[PDB]
From Swiss-Prot, chains A, E, F:
It is an enzyme of class 3 (hydrolase). Pfam families: Urease_gamma. Although not discussed in the published references, Met-1 is represented in the submitted PDB entries as being modified by either a formyl, a carboxyl, or an acetyl group. The N-terminal is probably N-(dihydroxymethyl)methionine, the hydrated form of N-formylmethionine. NCBIfam families: PRK13241.1, urease_gam. Pathway: Nitrogen metabolism; urea degradation; CO(2) and NH(3) from urea (urease route): step 1/1. Keywords: Cytoplasm, Formylation, Hydrolase. Its EC number is 3.5.1.5. The lineage of its organism: Bacteria, Bacillati, Bacillota, Bacilli, Bacillales. This is Urease subunit gamma. It is found in: Cytoplasm.
Swiss-Prot record, chains B, D:
It is found in: Cytoplasm. Binds 2 nickel ions per subunit. This is Urease subunit alpha. It comes from Sporosarcina pasteurii (Bacillus pasteurii). Inhibited by fluoride. Residues 132-570 form the Urease domain. It is an enzyme of class 3 (hydrolase). Keywords: Cytoplasm, Hydrolase, Metal-binding, Nickel. It catalyses: urea + 2 H2O + H(+) = hydrogencarbonate + 2 NH4(+). Heterotrimer of UreA (gamma), UreB (beta) and UreC (alpha) subunits. Three heterotrimers associate to form the active enzyme.
Swiss-Prot record, chain C:
It comes from Sporosarcina pasteurii (Bacillus pasteurii). PANTHER family: UREASE. GO terms for cellular component: urease complex. This is Urease subunit beta. Its EC number is 3.5.1.5. The keyword Cytoplasm applies. Its main location: cytoplasm. It catalyses: urea + 2 H2O + H(+) = hydrogencarbonate + 2 NH4(+). Transmembrane segments: none annotated. Belongs to the urease beta subunit family. It is found in: Cytoplasm.
Length: 100, 570, 122, 570, 100, 100
């Protein structure tokens, strides 16, 4: 596979997102790391899909809403940042105030 | 020109009279005073103040009042106060708390806090800064426990063990000269301060003392090695000669004596009573009465902290598992019921709040959680505020008194108890620069950066392959202070005076900073900061009810805690 | 009682910066063709040569703006700014090498400024 | 007997006139010459040539012209050529490039390239071998960055930092004697070559110079510490005395001067201009004009490399995040728009292709990617071939000229700029054996094996529990060169002459190889291999349009790159 | 996400449980580490759901039965222990003789 | 669970395969590490199922076809190797030219 250090680390974000998604699906309000994991994995998968940085800055604000998360979680998350390989190489996406 | 307070706090962190919520608790701390000169705040970045000829002095060499490191705009939470200041570090030590920058052009600059060519900058605006936690009940069982401790703001581990040997799995003991030597050498690779306890057992002095001379920093008396009157006595006679502390886990079984017999053996000498509530060990059911005595330095371990709805079920079973007890053997059930008591655990919450139990600790990996000493301290304070109200001593509607009482339990008090408070345990000039930065939203839960001897050792930081350090995954990671030979200069091995005088560090090739244990035998309860109360604690032998000043101490267990499911992935 | 973890509850009132120090308003023009942004704590007389102002009025002073902020001049932009007095020892070293000592030595500072083409020495 | 070329290349790697595609780019390199004697190729294995009495000599001791290591059948890609040779290493250094084996029986054996009892063998047939990359813009922020760098073929990190302190997070600076000492000690545990930059700020010489004497290898002037005429001047006066290089990140704000003022302060002295395009920092909007000057050694950092459809959106926001800028504050928006410019980023692609920007670098973890210097170099070359055609200098239909121009940017040129090219930066006899093997399909993307000082330090290798090393998971892993005390002998700490003369390595107990920085002040643009062009670069202050020789330099951003989604799991 | 050491480790238990569950679903009798993983993840997810320690001590004995696992596996597992964050903080759950 | 070093590592292959499978299911042509992960996990799960080495050498050539992967990926993968515990202990499987 030739995994580099970042590829190994970033597998763990996907895993944490899968965990959080299962928790959401059984009806739980999500906590801080769960919310961050879901949005982060969404960005990374979006890059893989070939979306632009600008599309993901927009979409990342609609992945989770306040009713999906515990009290205070929206205000704990000022932004979520992720780097991923786009069709045009690694780029940084920052989603500002992802959950209103 | 004036700035409103909201905007001021956003830019520089809070100032006098402003309050900050601790994580998701109901506890608020208030800035008591501020060392700054408004308008001359230090800060670092593009077009900011700490630039050459401006807030950075361009003239002075490092020796000439210049700092190695300035933490700008810190909100300090410490037994000494809750206040706003810059913190200056040099040669690995805190050398100034005050106002940093350049006397060329700024008013109010503390004279030895010059930002110069030699100065690194950490921005502490909007952070709470505390001393590194001092955990005095550590079993050295699994090296992976060190990062667990660092991640929750612990910087000193005092205890014993050789790894997952049964003696060590039960007791904070590194026994005998050879095991001590081996563990001092192992310590060279642990990125945290360390002090090692020998076995406080024997009926002759020499077998006990040779451990001190070998490099132990103290002793541990534990019932699993025979917490007899003789072992108690000999250990304290050694400790008095050697100027080290003795920790005790007493005879739960009351086999050779009841509490009064253990106190008679102690004979007024200073001792650190571990897990004084007793679920963690000690004379059943009344060990916690130790915490009323003037010669006793009393700590709790953490799984009883605070009293919750799952506590009893969890502990009763934890005890059965660990002792291989059987549910159908009445002696085993009776033993467990005599040891795990809601009456004493509920009173333990209150005794903390009253300043009668002076210290927290973990019992890491034996009956306690390496990364939850700080966590559970604050959860306890929060529960007590909810159930008992703001303390009478509070002013305004701040929780400053309670915050100073509780921060003392895991910083300065354990340091004083172990004879190491000259080096560590508080944010004071002249002490080692072990500092923990916290985002208020994560306060007490997950440390932002842990500074050891003036260099960051551990940090919550992100993708090492990214353009900047904040992208995911943000996780706790060892930093440059832990790498290469820098691990030697950023950490302290605490040792007895006799081992130091006898040249043990050179004999063993120890490269770490060597700390001297001292002034352990001339202290008492009165020396426990904000937690100095002596009183007669009565524990009813039949009902286990606890009374102080004729009043039953009871409170309810809570179903929910802050600093819990909002934060943790598991 | 919604909880925002770690939130502030600031006190009432406002913070006055640089309290008790003399304030001076002066007009400043960026005569250059590129933007110039000036930080709160630069000795004002030592800013970019192409800023035109009464250089004498920048001696011993800096911008009266919150610590760590800056004033921006687009090309050709002229505006007023408010200065405050430097504090401490009122000495400046380095930067543009116009002072290198006490800010009281106005004649020497201005001589150097003039010779090096810092605009606005009167 | 004759072998067809396809079969020959399959067995021994390519020979003269054969071409090889670089990863999934459109770039082809052609073998220019071959040192072998056809039929006497060296190889290792069952029934193969390097066996005793055959291609391995059985007579000579190690001292007698025998190698410690032979890389067989390497396709070398280097500023010195693109050619086929065996590479012989001894005492950690490259001692022979030519033809290895046994003079007993083989023709054409380079006299000091005897395969003997003492010789290890690496099979390089079918691999491309380059020098280890020299990254001269490293922020030491997170130790996990080292493996990221190794995995993409970097072997030397020059820069500064103390970990995730704000000074270090912004600037490649280890400030003052104490922080420098601490980081030299930390470096003992980093498995990569290192040189440390001090703070190039001050108005007196002594505070700056004492950093050089403490063990810094150079200085960094950064606007966040005040990139003033005074700090520029004093740093260069120090550098000229000390024979070390100065890197500059200039005054973006034009606060104390415009570009011409910075050039006046430099006063014709040699300087390394970091991220010369300026998105990474510098005089807005015209900093890139520095790259026209003969005394300037100009590098790019990597996030602008090459110009792509997501570049601007990504950078504008990256800058807003890092500077805590607000979208509704016009000064902040104006600052960002003045700094992140498609006009200068597009021209930067072309200036690379023209040999006007001489060097690549990362800006690791401050505004750049630790593991993408090599990657983006080749992506840039590929884009330029697509958009500008083969360069005029090319012969046949190979891209050899462009390949030598671009490999120079991350190997030899940074080494020359920093005064370390006597030790590292190219595959030449007499230099340290820092060598990177690449499978052509992974060229520039993921290194196969990274050799440090003649021992493999990092490799893409599989299951450690398997019968053989190739089963999954194949991942980058630290190898024996990084373990124990071998980390000392396989890596170099580069230091100033004065610190070496003053005995700093002994004072600090440094065990790594010590490299001397020298010959930094007597060089210029003309000394940048294949990238030596001086010209007047005009940058229009209104439109930001870049002209060279009266022609606007513009190109389009691309939607797709090679060396991207075919390879990476994220 | 601010993952601490335990959060990182415990992701791997969830993963091993997901693996084991897929093996069970395609009809395999589960082995020792598979069985332990499934029951351990069940406990941790139960804590996340807000169940009590006592509930999980009971439920953990009904997650897998002997027909779900290979010969000898029930007798190899004397107990399964897990710590997780309950609504009232970290607690230890021990499931005794989980598979009869 | 008593995880040894290989068991821990190999969990990550399963995870990478799960990731790749989700990418394939949403219609993406798979890249080099994704393809390797899918085939590798297939081999390991096959061993767990009790298939023979010879069966897996055959089946591994039919897991992904060239239309499932990006241009050049079939030619990048000369073989895929995995070791797993068969009913008769650890064995090595090499799938030669898995994608034509
Ligand atoms: Ni105990
Ligand atoms: Ni204990
Ligand atoms: Ni820069
Ligand atoms: Ni930089
Ligand atoms: O204990
Ligand atoms: O930079």
């Amino acid at each position: 596979m030739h995994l580099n250090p970042a590829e190994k680390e970033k597998l763990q974000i996907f895993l944490a997102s899968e965990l959080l998604l299962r928790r959401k699906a059984r009806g739980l309000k999500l906590n801080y790391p769960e919310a961050v994991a879901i949005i982060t994995s969404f960005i990374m998968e979006g890059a893989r899909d070939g979306k632009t940085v600008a599309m993901l800055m927009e979409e990342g604000k609609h992945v989770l809403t306040r009713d999906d998360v515990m009290e205070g979680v929206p205000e704990m998350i000022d932004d979520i940042q992720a780097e991923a390989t786009f069709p045009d190489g690694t780029k940084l996406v920052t989603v500002h105030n992802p959950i209103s | 020109m004036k700035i409103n307070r909201q905007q001021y706090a956003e830019s520089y962190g809070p100032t006098v009279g402003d309050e900050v919520r601790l994580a998701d608790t109901d506890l608020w701390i208030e800035v008591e005073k501020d060392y700054t000169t408004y308008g001359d705040e230090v800060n670092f970045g593009g077009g900011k103040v700490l630039r050459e000829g401006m807030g950075e002095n361009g003239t002075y060499t490092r020796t000439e009042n210049v700092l190695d490191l300035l933490l700008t705009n810190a909100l300090i939470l410490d037994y000494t106060g809750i206040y706003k200041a810059d913190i200056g570090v040099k040669d690995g030590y805190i050398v100034g708390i005050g106002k940093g920058g350049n006397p060329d052009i700024m008013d109010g600059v503390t004279p030895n806090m010059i930002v110069g060519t030699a100065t690194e900058v950490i921005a502490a605006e909007g952070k709470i800064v505390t001393a590194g936690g001092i955990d005095t009940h550590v079993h050295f069982i699994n090296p992976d426990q060190v990062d667990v401790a660092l991640a929750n703001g612990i910087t000193t581990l005092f205890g014993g063990g050789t790894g997952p040997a049964e003696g060590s799995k039960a007791t904070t003991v590194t026994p005998g000269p050879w095991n001590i030597e081996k563990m001092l050498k192992s310590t060279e690779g642990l990125p945290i301060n360390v002090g090692i306890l020998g076995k406080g057992h024997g009926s002759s002095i020499a077998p006990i003392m040779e451990q001190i001379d070998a490099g132990a920093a103290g002793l541990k008396i534990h019932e699993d090695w025979g917490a007899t009157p003789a072992s108690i006595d000999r250990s304290l006679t050694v400790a008095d000669e050697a100027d080290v502390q003795v920790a005790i886990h007493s005879d739960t079984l009351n086999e050779a004596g009841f509490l009064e017999d253990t106190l008679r053996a102690i004979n007024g000498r200073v001792i650190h009573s571990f897990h004084v509530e007793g679920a963690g060990g000690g004379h059943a059911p009344d060990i916690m009465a130790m915490a009323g005595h003037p010669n006793v330095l009393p700590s709790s371990t953490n799984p009883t902290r605070p009293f919750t709805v799952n506590t009893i079920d969890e502990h009763l079973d934890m005890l059965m598992v660990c002792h291989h007890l059987k549910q159908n053997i009445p002696e085993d059930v009776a033993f467990a019921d005599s040891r795990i008591r809601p009456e004493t655990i509920a009173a333990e919450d209150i005794l903390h709040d009253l300043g009668i139990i002076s210290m927290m600790s973990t019992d890491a990996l034996a009956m306690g959680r390496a990364g939850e000493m700080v966590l559970r301290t604050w959860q306890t304070a929060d529960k007590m505020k909810k159930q008992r109200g703001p303390l009478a001593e509070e002013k305004n509607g701040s929780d400053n008194f309670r915050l100073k009482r509780y921060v003392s339990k895991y910083t300065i008090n354990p340091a004083i108890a172990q004879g190491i408070a000259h080096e560590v345990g508080s944010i004071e000039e002249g002490k080692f620069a072990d500092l923990v930065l916290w985002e208020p939203k994560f306060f007490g839960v997950k440390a932002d950066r842990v500074i050891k001897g003036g260099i960051i050792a551990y940090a919550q930081i992100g993708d090492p392959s990214a353009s900047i350090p904040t992208p995911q995954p943000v996780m706790g990671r060892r930093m440059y202070g832990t790498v290469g030979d820098l691990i030697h200069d950023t950490n302290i091995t605490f040792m007895s005076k006799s081992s130091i005088q006898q040249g043990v560090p050179a004999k063993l090739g120890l490269k770490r900073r060597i700390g001297t244990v001292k002034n352990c035998r001339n202290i008492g309860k009165k020396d426990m900061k904000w937690n100095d109360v002596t009183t007669d604690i009565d524990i009813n032998p039949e009902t286990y009810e606890v009374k102080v000043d004729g009043e039953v101490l009871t409170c309810e267990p809570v179903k929910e805690l802050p600093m819990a499911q909002r934060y943790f992935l598991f | 009682n919604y909880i925002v973890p770690g939130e502030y509850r600031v006190a009432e009132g406002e913070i006055e910066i640089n309290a008790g120090r003399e304030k001076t308003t002066i007009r400043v023009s960026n005569t250059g063709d590129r933007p110039i942004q000036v930080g709160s704590h630069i000795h004002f007389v030592e800013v970019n040569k192409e800023l035109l102002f009464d250089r004498a009025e920048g001696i011993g002073r800096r911008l009266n703006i919150p610590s760590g902020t800056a004033a921006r001049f687009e090309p050709g932009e002229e505006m007023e700014v408010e200065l405050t007095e430097l504090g401490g020892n009122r000495e400046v070293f380095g930067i543009s090498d116009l002072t290198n000592g006490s800010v009281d030595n106005k004649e020497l500072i201005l001589q150097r400024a003039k010779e090096l083409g810092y605009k606005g020495v009167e």
